[PDB]
Assembly symmetry: none
Homo-oligomer: 50 residues x 4
């Protein structure tokens, strides 16, 4: 035990938990952004054909 | 008619709004939980 | 050297994160469901 | 009317798949992080 190494490891666990969450939420929003662009494009293409 | 076009576009807009609001709420709740554990480590170290 | 309080706080952090996720997903499904049933009940 | 409704079906399906896959990936990454701290503590075992 090093109260030091243990403290370091716990703090890194908490930091990484937040890092993983932020990276996930951004990726999710990006992929949703793309799915939304796609259905918008369909609506336009459908209208063009009217 | 253009009425179908209206309802379908609104369905999609509401789907997006629900998604946006819920993602914001989720991030806020997770952020408070994160604040809580970080505050605990600060206090504990003091 | 071992802190039960630190152990329990960390386990609660992880528990609350899971709970927030499960509750958020459930709420998200409810809200999307209300919206879907509206577009369906528009017809006709 | 029907062809638009079917295309909206695929949008809704795709949004569900994006959400489900994102949740799986998120769980996997948090899992690795939790496993790492668990492994650190198992080093204290005789």
């Amino acid at each position: 035990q090093w109260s030091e190494e243990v403290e370091r490891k716990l703090k890194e666990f908490v930091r990484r938990h937040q890092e993983i969450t932020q990276e996930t939420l951004h990726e999710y929003a990006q992929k949703l952004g793309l799915n939304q662009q796609a259905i918008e494009q369909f609506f336009r293409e459908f209208e063009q054909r009217k």
